[PDB]
Each structure stands twice: as structure tokens, then as C-alpha cells.
Amino acid sequence: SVFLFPPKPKDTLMISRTPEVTCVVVQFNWYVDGVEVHNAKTKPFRVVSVLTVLHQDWLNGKEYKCKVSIEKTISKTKGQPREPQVYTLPPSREEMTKNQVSLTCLVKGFYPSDIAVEWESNGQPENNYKTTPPMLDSDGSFFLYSKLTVDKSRWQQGNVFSCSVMHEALHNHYTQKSLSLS
Amino acid sequence: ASSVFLFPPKPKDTLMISRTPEVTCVVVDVSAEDPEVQFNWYVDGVEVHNAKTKPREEQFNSTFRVVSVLTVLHQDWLNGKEYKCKVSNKGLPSSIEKTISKTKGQPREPQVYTLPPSREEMTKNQVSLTCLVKGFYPSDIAVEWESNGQPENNYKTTPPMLDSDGSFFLYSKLTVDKSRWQQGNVFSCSVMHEALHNHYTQKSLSLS
Numbered sequence: 001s002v003f004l005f006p007p008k009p010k011d012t013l014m015i016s017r018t019p020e021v022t023c024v025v026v027q028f029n030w031y032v033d034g035v036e037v038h039n040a041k042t043k044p045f046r047v048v049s050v051l052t053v054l055h056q057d058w059l060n061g062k063e064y065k066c067k068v069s070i071e072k073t074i075s076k077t078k079g080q081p082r083e084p085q086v087y088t089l090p091p092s093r094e095e096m097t098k099n100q101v102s103l104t105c106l107v108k109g110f111y112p113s114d115i116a117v118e119w120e121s122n123g124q125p126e127n128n129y130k131t132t133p134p135m136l137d138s139d140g141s142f143f144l145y146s147k148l149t150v151d152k153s154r155w156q157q158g159n160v161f162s163c164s165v166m167h168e169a170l171h172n173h174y175t176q177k178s179l180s181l182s
Numbered sequence: 183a184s185s186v187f188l189f190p191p192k193p194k195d196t197l198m199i200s201r202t203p204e205v206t207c208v209v210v211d212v213s214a215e216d217p218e219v220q221f222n223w224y225v226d227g228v229e230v231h232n233a234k235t236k237p238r239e240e241q242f243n244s245t246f247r248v249v250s251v252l253t254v255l256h257q258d259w260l261n262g263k264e265y266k267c268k269v270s271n272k273g274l275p276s277s278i279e280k281t282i283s284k285t286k287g288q289p290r291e292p293q294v295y296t297l298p299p300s301r302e303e304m305t306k307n308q309v310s311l312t313c314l315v316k317g318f319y320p321s322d323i324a325v326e327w328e329s330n331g332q333p334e335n336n337y338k339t340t341p342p343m344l345d346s347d348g349s350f351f352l353y354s355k356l357t358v359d360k361s362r363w364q365q366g367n368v369f370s371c372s373v374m375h376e377a378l379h380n381h382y383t384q385k386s387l388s389l390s
């Protein structure tokens with residue numbers, strides 16, 4: 001049997017990273033848009049072959065075919081890309097009876113579902129956050145929420161937190177939205 | 183050969199006394215060349231005879247599927263009784279059994295917070311009203327929205343997700359026309375969970 005895996009979403013969106021398609025057999029011929037390419041790297045039973053893809057090729061829907069000597073074909077999810085709308089929501093006043101409070105990042109209206117969300121403060125990643133998997137909304141687009149938990153003191157003292165979102169339909173494939181007491 | 187799957191009642195059914203919770207035992211990969219599929223059901227090891235077993239149904243992969251459904255009492259389920267479905271073939275000694283009960287662990291009461299739309303969303307025709315539900319255990323929960331006495335339909339609720347402290351959280355997002363929000367209408371996020379007093383709480387929000 002043969003299995004073919006796409007690049008990691010982040011690798012396709014950031015030019016500093018190198019996206020790859022992975023062919024796993026549990027000899028290789030690789031094709032991009034039916035044209036044979038010869039730059040894949042094959043590690044010496046499980047056999048793995050890895051093809052580096054160009055960012056623009058992948059995002060532009062080119063098809064990647066792995067032929068083992070059985071054939072598999074993969075490409076980016078199809079459908080009109082839609083820009084994530086990113087909104088930061090402060091903790092409820094009612095949550096202030098607790099020692100920790102919840103900072104919320106709502107990300108909605110995006111397509112495809114491939115996305116990365118992180119929370120930070122002072123340019124450093126926050127340790128305590130969790131993000132819901134994207135979920136289908138009424139209009140066929142996706143939403144999610146990322147919940148950052150912080151000591152209440154850090155919130156009350158006016159510290160600035162930021163929700164970072166990486167998606168293909170954003171300018172520079174990246175946006176940051178701030179959240180602090182105001 | 184056969185595979186048996188045993189499903190718990192829906193959380194809304196266990197938490198609302200007027201609803202009827204049930205456990206469902208499903209047998210797949212049944213061959214019609216084998217003897218009749220038989221179900222024996224047990225509550226805390228004691229055999230019960232009130233299950234309703236459906237006729238077998240041919241599937242589109244040269245197999246049959248057979249379902250048996252057992253009504254459960256609300257207090258029995260909530261008190262942690264164990265429900266065993268034992269599947270066998272008439273005249274053969276071998277069997278497959280599955281057991282299910284309410285998730286074990288110290289129950290923890292959900293904290294429920296309502297969050298208005300971001301100022302930045304107010305440039306759209308529709309806005310998002312958020313209900314954060316956190317700190318709960320077990321994950322079994324029901325969340326709904328109402329306004330002016332009536333259910334609000336246009337919401338989506340994320341599945342419970344494990345938080346860093348072993349409890350669960352979710353968010354429910356209600357989409358409303360901005361004019362409805364702007365004119366002062368009160369919206370209510372309703373939550374049903376075993377660890378709440380009366381298995382019920384509601385939190386409201388409106389423009390203020």
C-alpha cells in the first residue's frame with residue numbers, strides 16, 4: 001500500500017519554510033501536473049520519499065503524483081479562498097472573581113480550513129492556550145476560537161497580548177490582533 | 183467476525199427529566215449464514231428484559247446490521263450504573279460483550295461567560311455573540327441560545343475540548359443581525375450539565 005501526504009500548512013504559507021509532499025510505502029516516480037520531476041529525496045519494511053514543493057505551485061493547485069514501482073495524487077483543498085476575520089474578546093467581568101482569566105480570539109469566515117493561530121505577549125509565545133479545530137459555519141466557511149489563560153494580575157496591570165493568525169487569504173499570509181485592558 | 187458498538191445516551195436526554203435517554207447496542211458485519219443474533223442486556227450485572235431489538239437490516243457490503251435499544255432511567259445513568267450488551271448467535275456458546283457507563287471522575291461545574299461582539303465586527307451586517315463555557319467535567323453538556331422567550335436557531339457550538347487542567351471548555355457562537363444587537367435585545371446562553379444546580383444555568387447579554 002501507498003500513502004501520500006500534503007505539506008504542513010505553515011510550510012506553504014511562510015517563505016522562510018520549505019513545504020514538502022511525502023510518499024510512504026508500507027523506486028519512486030514523481031509528477032507535478034503530469035510532468036516528471038527528478039529532485040525527490042528517498043531514505044533507504046517502510047520506504048519514504050520526500051518531494052520539496054514550491055510554495056506558489058502548491059497554493060496554485062498543482063497536482064502531485066507519486067508512482068511506486070500503485071499511484072496516488074494530492075493537491076490543495078479546492079474552493080474560493082476567503083479571508084479570516086480576526087477578533088479579540090476580553091474576559092468577562094464575571095470571570096474576575098477567579099485567579100486566572102480567559103482571553104479570546106475569534107477567527108471566522110475563512111476558507112480553506114488550513115490555518116495556524118498562536119497567542120503571544122512581548123514577542124514571546126504564551127504557555128497556556130488551546131485552540132478549537134476549525135468548524136463549518138452556515139455559509140460553508142470555517143470558524144474557531146483560541147482561548148488564552150493568564151494570571152488575572154497580568155490582565156489587570158495592562159499587559160498587551162496578541163493573537164497571530166496564518167492563512168493563505170490574509171495579506172502577507174499573516175495578521176496580528178492585540179488585546180489589552182482599555 | 184462481528185463487531186459490536188455500544189453508544190451512551192445523549193447528554194440532553196440524561197439531563198432533562200422530560201426526555202428519554204437510551205443506550206444503543208449495534209452489531210455490524212453480521213452474516214445471514216450464521217444463526218440469529220441474540221442480545222442479552224444487564225444493568226449492574228442484573229439481566230433486564232425491556233430492550234427493544236430491531237429486525238436485522240441488509241447493508242450494501244454483503245453484511246447485515248442489527249440494533250438493540252435499552253431505555254435507561256435518568257437517576258440510574260447519573261448514579262453510574264453499568265450497562266452491558268452481550269451479543270451472541272443462537273445455539274453457540276461464544277459471545278462479544280461491551281459495557282458502558284457515565285464517565286467517571288470528580289464532576290466540576292461549568293463556568294459560563296457571555297462575551298459581546300468585538301468593536302471591529304460592528305462594520306458587518308451580522309455580529310457574533312459568544313458564550314464561553316469552561317472548567318467542566320465530564321464533557322457531557324448541552325448549550326442553547328434564547329431571546330425574548332424564544333429559541334435562537336443561528337448558532338454553532340464547538341465540541342468540548344480538553345483544557346490544560348483536565349477539565350473541558352467550549353464556545354458557542356450565535357450570529358445575529360447587527361440591528362437586533364444594536365436595539366438592546368437581551369440574548370441568553372443556556373447550559374445543561376450534571377454538576378450544575380438543577381442541571382441548568384443561563385447567562386444573559388445585551389448592549390451596555
Ligand SMILES: *[C@@H]1O[C@H](CO[C@@H]2O[C@@H](C)[C@@H](O)[C@@H](O)[C@@H]2O)[C@@H](O[C@@H]2O[C@H](CO)[C@@H](O[C@@H]3O[C@H](CO[C@H]4O[C@H](CO)[C@@H](O)[C@H](O)[C@@H]4O[C@@H]4O[C@H](CO)[C@@H](O)[C@H](O)[C@H]4NC(C)=O)[C@@H](O)[C@H](O[C@H]4O[C@H](CO)[C@@H](O)[C@H](O)[C@@H]4O)[C@@H]3O)[C@H](O)[C@H]2NC(C)=O)[C@H](O)[C@H]1NC(C)=O
Nearest residue numbers: 185187189190192206207208210211241242243244245247
Ligand atoms: C459494512 O457496512 C457497515 C454499515 O455501514 C454503512 O453501510 C456501508 C455499506 C457504508 O455505506 C457505510 O458508509 C455506511 O455507514 C459498516 O458498519 C460500520 O462499522 C464500523 C466499524 O468497522 C463502525 O465504526 C465505528 O463507528 C463509531 C461511531 O459510530 C457512530 O458514528 C458514525 C460516524 O458518524 C455513524 O455512521 C454511526 O451510525 C454511529 O452513529 C452513532 O449511532 C448511535 C446509535 O445509533 C447514536 O446514538 C450516535 O449519536 C451516533 N453518532 C453520530 C456521531 O452520529 C466509532 O465510535 C468507532 O470508533 C471506535 O472504535 C474503533 C475500533 O473499532 C477505534 O479504532 C476508535 O478509536 C473508536 O474507539 C468506529 O469507527 C460504524 O459505526 C459502522 N456503521 C454503522 C452505520 O453502524 C461495516 O464496517 C462494513 N463492513 C465491512 C467489512 O466493510
